[PDB]
Amino acid sequence: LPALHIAARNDDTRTAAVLLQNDPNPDVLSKTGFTPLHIAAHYENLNVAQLLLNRGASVNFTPQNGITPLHIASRRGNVIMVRLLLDRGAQIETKTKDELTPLHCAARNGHVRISEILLDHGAPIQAKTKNGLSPIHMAAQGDHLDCVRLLLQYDAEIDDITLDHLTPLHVAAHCGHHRVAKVLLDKGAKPNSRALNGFTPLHIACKKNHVRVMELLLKTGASIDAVTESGLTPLHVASFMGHLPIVKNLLQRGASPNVSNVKVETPLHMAARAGHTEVAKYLLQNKAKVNAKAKDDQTPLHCAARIGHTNMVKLLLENNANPNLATTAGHTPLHIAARE
């Protein structure tokens, strides 16, 4: 019975045949609690699967985890096991501990044919797990392109959200896949859709440094100008994360370094908070006013003084920001330099 599962693993027909000729127990639990049918679904041994299904092997026999054998068979991707388990009877609409449907596990691994068969057999396409993610969102995570095409062709509501409002464009830009971004763009989407933070997918692309997604989004026509709920811009996100080629492309394609947030901060102010040097040189090369005032009228020398970075100053002194300049409180770059 710790060896009945070994007989299931090796598809030992005669041994299990004797074991069920003598014993009347068709299902026992291991220390984990998985039935012999669960381990039969894994290694795809189906002669013993027929032998079990001939007697008592409840397809809907959930332990405390609730993991059906159909869930594992859809997980590893065995087609004939799905057809057999569905022919003998199966409740498709079930939940795990995390309320995962069989379509959820099918979409995550990438098996497109199991998804076709299941959606043919009446599994609801629209669904919401514990968070609320649809199967299209999860399949868009694992970079499974043709599964996205299949879910769109049978039935899909594209602009679906979850508890944190996430369009599939948002997860596509967060996980760096431009291929599914193309399909979601040309079939149907909105670049203007904003998350709970108020972020465009362009903001996420500026954060996680994917470039090809940024190019596709801007060729579609997502606006360069955009206001986060904090008050930021994608130029500000790219400056704060330290990605140079994103800054290069965004500044080539038409941008303004002179932009103000809810606290008046240029990307020079937004850059000297971390001190990426080359982005600072590149922003200074184009038209940006280094002589500037922050919310408390801190010069970028004031924000640079707390870093302790030496050569960042000389580049700022190249455009001769005066040390005469001081904040509202009267503090000067010498004052903050001695404070820090």
Binding site: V79, V112, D146, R253, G254, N286
Partner: protein, 581 residues
């Protein structure tokens, strides 16, 4: 485990003997001999022994069943061609389970004279890759330089893999010209599916085939916007086919089982696991470095001039090795396995691997433009393209803009000069300016060849500064659609009526319309039918009747030829079931 035989069932005039086999044995034509103590040894027959991906203890073993049924038992495959922006499937027939494939393959194998190393699939795969690349270098003829449109209907039609195998071994059929040299991968896949090694045929668009060991490619362009001269040691091809085979690597350190790429070299072949290409370990096999250079390398572009001095130009970066695709399992749709070859661009991990491989190799603009062009262009039609120009300077500037269009073969070989256009513009006040221009086929200078792809280049020369901006795009040519109407299920030994519809979208009337239907297990060999003239406004609609015979899953293909174009192929699947008792 070792060779064994049991006498299970016994009759007064009969024995039923069950021969069993060891997991590691040499494949080939065997012969059984029976030797009693008294008589001379007696010949009992002949058989053949192959690999089985169904056995657990054998090396080449596949766990999932549907993967086996798709990659080993199937015969009706697809090969993807075209540019990476629009992918066109082409129906292909491997036909590995014909009668003569096994003996021909074994006769090709037996020229090795190292017998005992046939028990392992690694040696067989390497040897067969080397031999098939040598045969391709032997029997492939270059293209006829003279133009023969009347015989272009015969030069570039393909029927499958087995006729090409026969023509390569014996040379008693039609040759294969350089226009289609990419068949080789499919042929190798055929041989492996014959022998028991699962295999499939992948297509890499925009691959760097050429010289390797250097992560940089140079390209030279004319003042007018074309490519002065022909050829280069390393160029970016439009597409390239390769072969993947599934096996386990015992000779390597642990952790490399699975898919492997078969790579012949200019002859000794070898195979490399895909995870080695992803991780980037160069020193594991001498071929890993060139294949990893073949996927992600970047190009720089040079500008030739009248004086002979070459100039670097600032252009938009183009990607290399994108949209890796192959045939999906259990269906008739494409799937991309491109996540198995590269990390997502711009991750920490891909930056790490690039820095590591570069460290290992170390031991050994006031204005710009950008271009919008469609992904597909209709035959005998037209389209629109747009070039934008943005300047960053307080002063006005004069600029000269040139546009070039030319057809190219699939291996970067230039084919014909088609069109060029030069104009002068004056940008002012740091304002962007967009220029939209049409592209009509009637304005062209020549008719394009049978299999080409157009390369559209744009070069903006600043009048003051010699540093100029550049952009290039690739466009595939699309042909009118061929509709096939046919029911999904049919009964065995019953008539079945298919319908074929074609619309003349082209501006010319078609003459000598000749179509042909064929298919494995549906119609015996090949059928031909003739038609009247088709005017550019009207359509054509035709009907055929046949009868399925072999139960299961089949598909049929239709093929249309006329004076405007040749070898327009399409396909459609069907499931036929046994009749009710």
């Amino acid at each position: 485990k070792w060779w064994s035989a049991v006498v299970e069932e016994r009759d007064a005039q009969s024995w039923t003997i069950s021969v069993t086999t060891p997991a590691d044995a040499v494949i080939g034509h065997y012969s059984l001999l029976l030797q009693v103590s008294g008589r001379k040894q007696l010949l009992l027959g002949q058989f053949t022994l192959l690999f089985n991906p169904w056995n657990r203890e054998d090396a080449v073993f596949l766990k999932n069943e549907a993967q086996r049924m798709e990659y080993l038992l199937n015969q009706n495959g697809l090969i993807y061609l075209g540019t990476a922006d629009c992918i066109q499937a082409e129906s292909w027939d491997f036909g590995q389970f014909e009668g003569d494939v096994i003996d021909l393959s074994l006769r090709l194998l037996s020229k090795d004279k190292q017998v005992e190393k046939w028990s392992q699939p690694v040696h067989v795969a390497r040897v067969l890759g080397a031999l098939l690349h040598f045969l391709k270098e032997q029997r492939v003829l270059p293209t006829p330089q003279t133009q023969a449109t009347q015989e272009g209907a015969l030069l570039n039609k393909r029927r499958g893999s087995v006729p090409i195998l026969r023509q390569w071994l014996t040379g008693r059929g039609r040759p294969v010209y350089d226009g289609q040299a990419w068949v080789l991968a499919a042929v190798a896949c055929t041989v492996l599916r014959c022998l028991g090694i699962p295999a499939r045929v992948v297509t890499t668009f925009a691959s760097a085939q050429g010289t390797g060991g250097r992560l940089l490619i140079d390209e030279y362009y004319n003042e007018e916007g074309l490519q002065n001269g022909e050829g280069q040691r390393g160029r970016i091809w439009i597409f390239q086919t390769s072969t993947e085979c599934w096996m386990t690597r015992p000779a390597l350190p642990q952790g490399y089982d699975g898919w492997q790429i078969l790579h012949p070299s200019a002859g000794s072949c070898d195979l490399v696991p895909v995870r080695a290409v992803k991780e980037g370990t160069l020193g594991l096999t001498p071929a890993v470095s060139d294949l990893f250079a073949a996927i992600n390398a970047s190009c720089v572009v040079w500008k030739c001039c009248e004086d002979g001095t070459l100039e670097l130009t600032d252009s938009n970066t183009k990607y290399v090795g994108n949209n890796i695709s192959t045939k999906g399992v259990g269906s008739d749709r494409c799937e991309d396995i491109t996540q198995n070859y590269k990390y997502p661009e711009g991750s920490l991990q891909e930056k790490e691997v690039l820095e590591r491989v570069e460290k290992e190799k170390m031991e050994r603009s006031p204005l710009y433009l950008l271009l919008k062009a469609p992904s597909s262009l209709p035959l005998r039609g037209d389209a629109q393209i747009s070039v934008t120009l943005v300047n960053h300077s307080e002063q006005e500037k004069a600029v000269q803009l040139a546009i070039g269009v030319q057809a190219v073969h699939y291996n970067g070989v230039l084919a014909a000069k088609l069109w060029r256009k030069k104009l002068h513009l004056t940008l002012s006040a740091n304002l962007e300016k967009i220029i939209t221009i049409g592209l009509f086929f009637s304005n062209f200078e020549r008719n394009p060849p049978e299999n080409t792809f157009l390369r559209l280049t744009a070069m903006a020369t600043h009048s003051e500064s010699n540093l100029s901006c550049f952009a290039q795009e690739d466009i595939a040519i699309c042909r009118p659609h061929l509709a096939i109407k046919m029911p999904e299920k049919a009964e065995q030994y019953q008539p079945l009526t298919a319908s074929v519809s074609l619309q003349n979208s082209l501006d010319a009337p078609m003459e000598d319309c000749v179509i042909s239907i064929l298919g494995r297990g549906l119609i015996h060999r090949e059928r031909s039918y003739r038609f009247r003239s088709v005017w550019p406004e009207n359509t054509m609609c035709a009907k055929f009747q046949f009868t399925p015979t072999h139960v299961g899953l089949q598909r049929l293909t239709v093929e249309v030829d006329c004076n405007m174009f040749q070898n327009l192929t399409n396909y459609k699947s069907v499931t036929v079931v046994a009749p009710e008792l």
